[PDB]
Amino acid sequence: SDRVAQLTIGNSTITTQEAANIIVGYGEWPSYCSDSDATAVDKPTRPDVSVNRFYTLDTKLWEKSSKGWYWKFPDVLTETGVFGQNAQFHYLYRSGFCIHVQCNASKFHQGALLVAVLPEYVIGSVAGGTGTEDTHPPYKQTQPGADGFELQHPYVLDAGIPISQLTVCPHQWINLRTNNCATIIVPYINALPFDSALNHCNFGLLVVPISPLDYDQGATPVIPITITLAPMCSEFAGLRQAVTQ
């Protein structure tokens, strides 16, 4: 926890100083969460720690020709990312999160982003003629990687849903003009009390640059984007298979 464990670096590309930018709404870790109920002969347990620290996946770069990127959960919690030592064994999973997005730029750049979390974000793929009613949902697209993937048509959100009405979900406006911080908290969202470690992927994270990035020649042409997450209140259990030892 704190800011150290294995990863102790606290200085990104601009090597910034002078305190941090968080802007807290809640009161410093507002309590634990529930356990719910079930209707079968299964029951999970808790792994406590080693998942309670912070994590900083790779930094994607913003350019003028950018279109936006998205992530799927808990795809990045698996081996597809830093973790993967306690994610592919068990069967049940559920957790909150403390997602923090930190950007950085000089005072001469312009542009503005938009963060949003869409629960049960099922992509309708690129489509456009790929006639599929129900044959085989893809796995090479819905799980790109911990790096995310650039969008094709952000206006229709590559699914047919308009981008304009996105702000219904929780969202913040990353504006290069004034601030660079973005802290969001997402509780557990699922119909069933507990989820599986399989193709029942939870909410997806969306980041779309609405205001295009621009500047004058001679300055830095690319602005990095940092992604951090903190799995509040996670669990792991459930396993039964062939020959055991």
Partner: protein, 297 residues
């Protein structure tokens, strides 16, 4: 003996408070002064104001009751049930005397929403829902003339077998509820309970006795032609043989006790298929009627 323990994740202080019941608003606020009121005094124009408060004839006095309109109508036609008010014609089952559509009298149909794109549009504003259901049945000849005849209706719960021929014992059964009524009688009003195996309607692995969900290895989401085994319907013509009149049956579905969760942006593309919201990725269209310029209308 024990050396390791750590959970934390807690906060202490002003969690909850006193327990009261005072569902009545009172005069709140008044006024506060700032500075010299001017138009172009230098910092910002178009300054603000404030009020105190009042709530109809309940709060404060009740000396005069001057509403905006002298009680024209009701003011709550906006709830979820109000939205889901009508009962649209969902099923249009057709029974000819002879032909290829339904030659053997039997006709199988199942509940769905993709039959009406408008209904699907209206129903897909959310993610999770929980509602009851009702059904009404009207039978008439293509020329609209009642005839003397008896009909057999039956509901089929999820996972039950499919009666294919008129001679199928599934028509007999004992577990599948059935309804018998002559068509000259009034229509057959009926209700259907909440038949989902979870707390909200959501597809994927919910049908078939076998497996499901994404990335199949152990199951097919086909089940032959009746994909996604769920609440379906069946209908015969009562008789050891064929009937003497053509029939055109109709369905009327109606929600009741509707509760939604997790709204999402509605839609901005034409629907393509069932259970797979694709779109015209090469024929992407705008949303509103575009105008010529921005300076002028």
């Amino acid at each position: 003996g024990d050396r390791v323990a750590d959970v934390i994740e807690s906060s202490i202080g002003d969690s909850v408070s006193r327990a009261l019941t005072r569902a009545l608003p009172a005069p709140t606020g008044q006024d506060t002064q700032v500075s010299s009121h001017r138009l172009d005094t230098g910092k910002v124009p178009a300054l603000q104001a404030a009020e105190i408060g009042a709530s109809s004839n309940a709060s404060d006095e009740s000396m005069i009751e001057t509403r905006c309109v002298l009680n024209s109508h009701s003011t709550a036609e906006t709830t979820l049930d109000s939205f889901f008010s009508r009962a649209g014609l969902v099923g249009e089952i057709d029974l000819p005397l002879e032909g290829t559509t339904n030659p053997n009298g039997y006709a199988n149909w199942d509940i769905d929403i993709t039959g009406y794109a408008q209904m699907r549009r209206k129903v897909e504003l959310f993610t999770y829902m929980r509602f009851d259901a009702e059904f009404t049945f009207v039978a008439c000849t293509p020329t609209g003339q009642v005839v003397p005849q008896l009909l057999q209706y039956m509901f089929v719960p999820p996972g039950a077998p499919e009666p294919d021929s008129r001679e199928s014992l599934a028509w007999q059964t004992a577990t599948n509820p059935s309804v018998f009524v002559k068509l000259s009688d009034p229509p057959a009003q009926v209700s259907v309970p909440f038949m989902s195996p979870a707390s909200a309607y959501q597809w994927f692995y919910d049908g078939y006795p076998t497996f499901g969900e994404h990335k199949q290895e152990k199951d097919l989401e086909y089940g032959a032609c009746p994909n996604n085994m769920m609440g379906t319907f069946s209908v015969r013509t009562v008789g050891t043989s064929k009937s003497k009149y053509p029939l055109v049956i109709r369905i009327y579905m109606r929600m009741k006790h509707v509760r939604a969760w997790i709204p999402r942006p509605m839609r901005n593309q034409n629907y393509l298929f069932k259970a797979n919201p694709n779109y015209a990725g090469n024929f992407i269209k705008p949303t509103g009627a575009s105008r010529t310029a921005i300076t002028t209308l």
